[PDB]
Design a protein around this ligand. Sequence first.
Ligand SMILES: OC[C@H]1O[C@@H](O)[C@H](O)[C@@H](O)[C@@H]1O
Ligand SMILES: *[C@@H]1O[C@H](CO)[C@@H](O)[C@H](O)[C@H]1O
Lengths: 504, 504
Amino acid sequence: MKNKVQLITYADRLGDGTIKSMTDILRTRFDGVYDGVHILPFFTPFDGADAGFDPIDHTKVDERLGSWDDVAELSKTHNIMVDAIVNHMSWESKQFQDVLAKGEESEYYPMFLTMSSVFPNGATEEDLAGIYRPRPGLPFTHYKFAGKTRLVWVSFTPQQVDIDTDSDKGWEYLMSIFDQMAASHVSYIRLDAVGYGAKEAGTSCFMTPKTFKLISRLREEGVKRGLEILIEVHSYYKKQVEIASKVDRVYDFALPPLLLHALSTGHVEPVAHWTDIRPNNAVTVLDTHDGIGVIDIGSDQLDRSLKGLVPDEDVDNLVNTIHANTHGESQAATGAAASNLDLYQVNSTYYSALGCNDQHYIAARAVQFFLPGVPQVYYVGALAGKNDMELLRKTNNGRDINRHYYSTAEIDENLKRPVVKALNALAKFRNELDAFDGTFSYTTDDDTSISFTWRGETSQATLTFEPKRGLGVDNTTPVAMLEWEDSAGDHRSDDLIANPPVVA
Amino acid sequence: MKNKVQLITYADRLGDGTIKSMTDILRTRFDGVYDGVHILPFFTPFDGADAGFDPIDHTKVDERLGSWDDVAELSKTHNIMVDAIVNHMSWESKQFQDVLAKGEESEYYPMFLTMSSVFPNGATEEDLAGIYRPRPGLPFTHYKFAGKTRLVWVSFTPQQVDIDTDSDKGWEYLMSIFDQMAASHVSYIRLDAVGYGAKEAGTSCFMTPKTFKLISRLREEGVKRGLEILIEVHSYYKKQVEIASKVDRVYDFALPPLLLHALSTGHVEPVAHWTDIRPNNAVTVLDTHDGIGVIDIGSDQLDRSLKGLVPDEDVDNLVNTIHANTHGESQAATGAAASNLDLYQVNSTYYSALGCNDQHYIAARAVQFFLPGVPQVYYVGALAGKNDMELLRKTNNGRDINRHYYSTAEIDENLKRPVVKALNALAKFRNELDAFDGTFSYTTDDDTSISFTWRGETSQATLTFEPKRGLGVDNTTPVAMLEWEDSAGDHRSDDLIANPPVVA
Ligand SMILES: OC[C@H]1O[C@@H](O)[C@H](O)[C@@H](O)[C@@H]1O
Ligand SMILES: *[C@@H]1O[C@H](CO)[C@@H](O)[C@H](O)[C@H]1O
């Protein structure tokens, strides 16, 4: 994967509404800023039950968005990352509709998982209660197979039916996706929900030995087609570190809430500890298309004795600080549970979670860019977007608070803001200075400060992070200082917004 | 049960927001119209997960609404009906919080149902799929019993934890509810969701022989304390007919959609057929605090070969007519379109469901009042209320479209309307004429007309229903004509709105 900043975006929410328009925005307004792009599911349909993650036909681009020719065109200037939705598909797909109609007489019957598929002799309460969950309740819903009520395995929405990734039909489907991506000049594959892809009776059904076999087989299939594999693992931090050694890339989901903690309290110790133990073959982010992960730094969902990166009270305080910073907006978008420790994610834009503080935001992006891994910036974050309450009230989908539809006019309005110009300049700096392709090192005191250093062939760069220098939502004091050496000599930036870093 | 019209209301949604104010509205605005009152759950709290149906303390009135002394005061002028939420309680209850803390060491552990208490040797897919559900998804959710993750049985919201009605602690709780109602001068008890009250492995866990035993045992305890029992059962019509012989009262849940069908199509045969086979020990309604039930007249959900009162095509047409009559308002609140506990109940006010037709609405109430049983008028219906789209968009709770907050000023404004004055007078007629305490008989003229007759000691009354003479939402032609005899002789009302009936 090229060590350049990438953009994560929906083809329709950035520009006029198509892949062609999204491509135009990328080329005309973000040249040198975003050299690669992760286009969120643009298959048929992109507006179903889970904003593209419930495809009827994964191999067919939604005609309202464009064609595979548009993807092939974009590849000429940008490396493309696309999702391979390996765990499930829409109930409205031809394959599942065939099973609803014919039941056991359908050639697609072994393609889908039911309670009986995994538990043929039945299940105890322990068997079902032990299944790791990304959504509330049990992972089952009612569907009629040729008139007979069956409990189909659904990890996410009831509309997303889980496939048997080890069945002949299920595997054939996965390979059709891979073939289509390789044929359309895609460079990187994001294996969506792969952690749930293998069901093993008596286990958590998440990142188990059977899942490791699936991931290894999918990785092998990717390399023979010239595709690189990225896996997302929203879990207890140790499971993320464990699988990292077995794959090309993993997302760093621990960094986003640790920086929210650091900027809110002043403590850099958790960030220092994470820097030491974290997998370095990473894809770094602050925001994604989903909510801000809290289970990613907290204690394990199944076993409460295995503690997180920060104590349980600090995770509880992190969630309460986001709610306060957003003035209750994040509370209206996040579903209430038994405790803040039972929360999977907190729905809010990263900018709003920081109380719209420009200095804290540019600092968080700087630390993101300075830690080993290929950085990705989500489109709402690229334009330093605020919580979209208008869309949330319209759709009633919590994650829509962080999924605003940006017209070309609105993108241009936002590109005038000093924080957005600072981010574009910071991304350019990250893409141009050869220091990032060199050796990484870090120095720390106790708490207070942490300095990240990269030394390359013809350059060097050091970023100092001091959150104690400016606490509070209405702060104007810079918490990130930058020093670098290039062709023109030694340079400095004590304010990433007022004095953006430019490579000579 | 006194053969007088009763009002179904929330203590807070009729008046200033208290039991004292609700009592004042009943006495000063509805004197002689409503002689009884079903006060919807006013326990601690009334504004939780399911508008009072998730009590933390069922024996304690919510401090914001009033006290038990207020209920005792209301009893001097009105016969009171209160709910006995026998199937579940809030997770925030002192009993459940103790189980979360101590687990198996809690004295309240056998009081709550888990998957293991019903299925100790495990469960098959058929065992779990066979459990009757008003919507897809299994009746289970996760809770930690002293650190151990357990699957607690929840028939409704995940916050409403199902109790074991056969346990010693579960029965002790139910008796404390009955004792509190008896001591606070309540006359009637509505056993909410009693159909789900008994769980047995291998059965539907809904209206099974074990449930009949519970209903019978709860009835025995009611009469011993001077309380009458009304049971709420939303099911295939035959289950309502069967259980009716074992209780004091059942609701007539078939009449509300049969009248919508009769008023839209002009067909009275299904009303005639129902009049012949219906349980007469009924509590009649048009609207309730929930949505309009359609499965109450349709085919059985667990066995489609058992047909309803009207063919399944007519049930689909009934639902589509409501959607058309409400200009899509009900389509925005029903099932999948908003948050609902029942997928098939149509969320709309009865008045809006008829396209706000005054003649059809008054005719529907007239038929309701003329069929055997004690009539109940829901507060929104008492004020001929329209769909509250503003409260619906504010909460996203589907049933809120039929749960408008009426201030004293809005009540008085609605009391000026001819249709509301017509209903007030019709109910006064229903309470004052002794014909209703006498002999019931009916005649029918082949699918076009039906005449309901009551003959008492000093009077007689006949209501002719002929919906074919006035089809369409913009109808002005009366479809219910009344003839009666009293101390002053023979009288007529060929228009219940322009000439409301008044007893001499
Ligand atoms: O496909 C189901 C879920 O999988 C996750 O990996 C994606 O990031 C989510 O956006 C999606 O809702
Ligand atoms: C009885 O059943 C459920 C559960 O308490 C409640 O939501 C309804 O409002 C009531 O009719």
